[PDB]
Design a protein around this ligand. Structure first.
Ligand SMILES: NC(=O)c1ccc[n+]([C@@H]2O[C@H](COP(=O)([O-])OP(=O)(O)OC[C@H]3O[C@@H](n4cnc5c(N)ncnc54)[C@H](O)[C@@H]3O)[C@@H](O)[C@H]2O)c1
Length: 350
């Protein structure tokens, strides 16, 4: 009758810490999961103290998730290999820029039948086209992979406000097991099988949200923001269908990972906040990230840069106006006030 699976949370930021509240509590409540939940924490010096000691002592990662405690059973562990050594389930939740290295170090040190689920929002590019982050993680570490994507602003999740998420998993058994580990009476999960489409949604919505922030930065309102979300979704489906392997069904975009995450993000996401300030101050995105997010990371612009690269290697840049408009305003120096023009001209269908 099975042993309890050990869970390792790789990452500890805003979303990561919020996910630890959920997981820490479920592992502690459910026999199937070992109560000892480890969390890899990239060590930091917070006023002389090591962040890993603060967490294991005060059970709170206030720098990244203020006003919330973490279940006492979540252990902070600075060495990622150690944190992951005995894990059966590995939740990958860290900003895009950091997984490669993490994977460099875990390769070959994971338990035999370990599996993983990625919560990361973004995309890489492969020797030939789009390469999903879960695929990258899955191939380097040699483990089966799932993805958890939905409209989940962390602060709200941490506050237990009602919300849902989508888990993409090909294996039914695993799909249900991961759902038992993540579901809360306020964190409702639907499991679907096209991992790819679900993941890509999480990645592309952040680019759209940068655009929404620009329009807020130009003084627009809801009718405009809705347009931006609608046109962004039109580009997302079209883009998913072109570059994703296997069938891409529009129905999947009606899941939380799609229309919902696109909405919540465009209204209260970090990408929207920094995007608006970019529109108002003219400062660099990098500078705004440092000045405004107290250490948290942006994914929207870097993702747009990735899209640019994927699209240009196929001379299809002219095909995704809204996406490319976000990229040009962030990186080429195109005046933000010109953003509206890409909406006014946007193709009616794609
Ligand atoms: N925050 C959210 O609301 C929310 C909701 C759903 C998905 N996500 C996604 O979750 C993923 C994880 O993001 P997050 O929000 O937990 O974090 P952050 O984006 O909150 O924090 C940056 C984090 O990265 C780490 N970091 C900084 N420099 C590092 C380095 N040099 N090496 C290794 N780590 C370093 C720190 O440990 C810190 O916790 C992201 O892809 C994001 O888009 C976030």
């Amino acid at each position: 009758s099975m042993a309890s699976k050990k869970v390792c949370i790789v990452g500890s930021g805003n979303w990561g810490s919020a996910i630890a509240k959920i997981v820490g509590g479920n592992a502690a409540q459910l026999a199937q999961f070992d109560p000892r939940v480890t969390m890899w924490v990239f060590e930091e010096d917070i006023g002389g103290k090591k962040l890993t000691e603060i967490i294991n002592t005060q059970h709170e990662n206030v720098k990244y998730l203020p006003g919330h405690k973490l279940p006492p059973n979540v252990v902070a562990v600075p060495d990622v290999v150690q944190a992951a050594e005995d894990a059966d389930i590995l939740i990958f939740v860290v900003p895009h820029q950091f997984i490669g290295k993490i994977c460099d170090q875990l390769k070959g040190h994971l338990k035999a039948n370990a599996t993983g689920i990625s919560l990361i929002k973004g995309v890489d590019e492969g020797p030939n086209g789009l390469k999903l982050i879960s695929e990258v993680i899955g191939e380097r570490l040699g483990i089966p992979m799932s993805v958890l994507m939905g409209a989940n602003i962390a602060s709200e999740v941490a506050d237990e406000k009602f919300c849902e998420t989508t888990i993409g998993c090909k294996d039914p058994a695993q799909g249900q097991l991961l759902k038992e580990l993540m579901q809360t009476p306020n964190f409702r999960i639907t499991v679907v099988q096209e991992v790819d489409t679900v993941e890509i949604c999480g990645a592309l919505k952040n680019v759209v949200a940068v655009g929404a922030g620009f329009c807020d930065g130009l003084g627009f309102g809801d009718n405009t923001k809705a347009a931006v979300i609608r046109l962004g979704l039109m580009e997302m489906i079209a883009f998913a269908k072109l570059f994703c392997s296997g069938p891409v069904s529009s129905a999947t975009f009606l899941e939380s990972c799609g229309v919902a995450d696109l909405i919540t993000t465009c209204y209260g996401g970090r990408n929207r906040k920094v995007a608006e300030a970019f529109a108002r101050t003219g400062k660099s995105i990098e500078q705004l990230e440092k000045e405004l997010l107290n250490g948290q990371k942006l994914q929207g612009p870097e993702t747009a840069r990735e899209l640019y690269s994927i699209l240009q290697h196929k001379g299809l840049v002219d095909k995704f106006p809204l996406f490319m408009a976000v990229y040009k305003v962030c990186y080429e120096g195109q005046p933000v006030g010109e953003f509206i023009h890409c909406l006014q001209n946007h193709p009616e269908h794609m």
